[PDB]
């Protein structure tokens with residue numbers, strides 16, 4: 001019965017979610033970079 | 046579509062965003078155009094692939 005009191009810990013499970021969310025947020029943000037080019041919208045160019 | 050220079054593709058739908066008389070096109074998080082405002086009617090429309 002004392003186990004619920006200690007809960008109401010799971011940081012190892014939240015870290016897995018965070019690491020993937022951070023890689024997906026970074027992957028999308030890297031599309032707004034010119035890399036020394038003229039612009040970053042394949043249309044403009 | 047082309048909205049005064051903005052070249053793209055997508056479906057146009059009625060929006061519920063509010064650009065203030067000084068706003069022309071609110072991009073979303075991750076820096077991609079998500080809404081435009083007509084160039085002679087001032088209607089705000091959402092865009093989506």
Ligand SMILES: *[C@@H]1O[C@H](CO)[C@@H](O[C@@H]2O[C@H](CO)[C@@H](O)[C@H](O)[C@H]2NC(C)=O)[C@H](O)[C@H]1NC(C)=O
Nearest residue numbers: 048049066069081082083084085086087088089
């Ligand atoms: C640019 O000129 C056009 C002329 O066709 C204008 O369109 C008209 O605008 C009036 C005012 O709201 C409407 O009553 C008419 O119905 C419109 N014409 C058509 C064919 O829809 C337009 O508003 C002008 N744009 C600007 C920014 O002045």
